[PDB]
């Protein structure tokens, strides 16, 4: 159960430097290669660069100029920096831990065998946006009078960039939870609203709290939801 | 080193569907798969042509020989739909890690789906910001394609509308939201609002009063 979480500022003016980080639980970075990959809105997987934990280094030459990655041992993360940052560095940036394999084809002493890597635990990514402008306000969506399944939310306009994460009752209440992707306005900003079906019967004397994240501008708002 | 992917491939459910992966003597290279659903990470499905990952279904199975790699997905499911990325590491190269274009996997001749449709009409506390919206979730539905249409008592309306486009649930059916911004001065106007919402030759309507 090794996991791998990436903590992004989500936005980064153009030409400043992008910094990231890697929390890897569950498992330790020594003995083991540290990948940064990021993906451009509808396009391909593109690999930036691996870091063995002893601190060896290795780069996509196309990204190699602006681009540092380092490793911390005492801390179990490994980090990103992005320089010189244009529109084209936005991206959902991902952490992976990296394995190396070798195949001995041969015999080892005439240096019939290679070496390769692959990535075979990722981070969930975070989402880099990059944009001159600046950085969500909630509001309740009540149940109305389904066939006994009640629809109940929360609306979350204005925000930007993204993500928004919704949880309901502090991640208690999972079942129902659909969280719908959100529009982009004409004005640029952000809407999302998400949605938990409840029992209608005895829909009273129950509390329904949505937990809204928006960690660009490091808010944690709660807002309870009755008719 | 040139890694040639078929940028789509289509397959009907339980089928077996081959995605294949070009590349000048790809045989006598490590060939690596990677899976990538709607909206979520890549995950590791091969490693070094033909290895399983821990969790990975019997059905994925890397092969590799000659000028070409290949992920082969029998009994395929319509959970399977996704980008998949073959990836190598040449040595003997400037550029050493090399992905694939990408693959994308449809699975056709899905079950129909009718959407479900909730609309909920502006808060009680959005009201007192002098703001308005009509909230008008889509969901379940299958194929992902349907067109929305507002109306503000039996007149259809243009203005202040921002419609999503069809995302993949988990249930590998599909949703997306309209939303309608009004002024309290126009809500409250009306005698009543519709969101029409209309899929594969037919129309779902549901409608709001303020009080």
């Known amino acids: 159960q090794v996991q791998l979480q990436e903590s992004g500022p989500g936005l980064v003016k153009p030409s400043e430097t992008l910094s990231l980080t890697c929390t890897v639980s569950g498992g330790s970075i020594s003995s083991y290669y540290w990948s940064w990959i990021r993906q451009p809105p509808g396009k391909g997987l593109e690999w930036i660069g691996y870091?063995?934990?002893?601190?060896?280094?290795n780069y996509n030459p196309s990204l190699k100029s602006r681009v540092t990655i380092s490793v911390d041992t005492s801390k179990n993360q490994f980090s990103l920096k992005l320089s010189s940052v244009t529109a084209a560095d936005t991206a959902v940036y991902y952490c992976?831990?990296?394995?190396?394999?070798?195949?001995?084809?041969?015999?080892?002493?005439?240096?019939?065998?290679?070496?390769?890597?692959?990535?075979?635990?990722w981070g969930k990514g975070t989402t880099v946006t990059v944009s001159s402008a600046s950085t969500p306000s909630v509001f309740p969506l009540a149940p109305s009078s389904s066939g006994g399944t009640a629809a109940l939310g929360c609306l979350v306009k204005d925000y930007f960039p993204e993500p928004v994460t919704v949880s309901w009752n502090s991640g208690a209440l999972t079942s129902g939870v659909h969280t719908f992707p959100a529009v982009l306005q004409s004005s640029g900003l952000y809407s999302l609203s998400s949605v938990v079906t409840v029992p209608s019967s005895s829909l009273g004397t129950q509390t329904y709290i949505c937990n809204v994240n928006h960690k660009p501008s490091n808010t944690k708002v709660d807002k309870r939801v009755e008719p | 080193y040139v890694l040639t992917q078929p940028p789509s491939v289509s397959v009907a459910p339980g089928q077996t569907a081959r995605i294949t992966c070009g590349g000048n003597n790809i045989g006598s290279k490590s060939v690596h798969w990677y899976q990538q659903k709607p909206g979520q990470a890549p995950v590791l499905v091969v490693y070094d042509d033909s290895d399983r990952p821990s969790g990975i279904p019997e059905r994925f199975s890397g092969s590799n020989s000659g000028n070409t790699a290949t992920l082969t997905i029998s009994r395929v499911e319509a959970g399977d739909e996704a980008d998949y990325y073959c990836?190598?590491?040449?040595?003997?190269?400037?550029?050493?890690?090399?992905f694939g274009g990408g693959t994308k996997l449809t699975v056709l001749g899905q079950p129909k789906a009718a959407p479900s449709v909730t609309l909920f009409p502006p808060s009680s506390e959005e009201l007192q910001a002098n703001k308005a919206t009509l909230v008008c979730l889509i969901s379940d539905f299958y194929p992902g394609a349907v067109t929305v249409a507002w109306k503000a008592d039996s007149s259809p309306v243009k203005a202040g509308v921002e419609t999503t486009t069809p995302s993949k649930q988990s249930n590998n059916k599909y949703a997306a939201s309209s939303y309608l911004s009004l002024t309290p001065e126009q809500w409250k106007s009306h005698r009543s609002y519709s969101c029409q919402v209309t899929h594969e030759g037919s129309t779902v309507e549901k409608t709001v009063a303020p009080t």
């Open positions: 990836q190598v590491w040449d040595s003997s190269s400037d550029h050493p890690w090399v």
């Open positions: 870091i063995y934990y002893s601190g060896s280094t």
């Open positions: 992976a831990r990296t394995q190396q394999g070798k195949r001995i084809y041969g015999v080892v002493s005439f240096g019939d065998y290679y070496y390769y890597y692959y990535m075979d635990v």
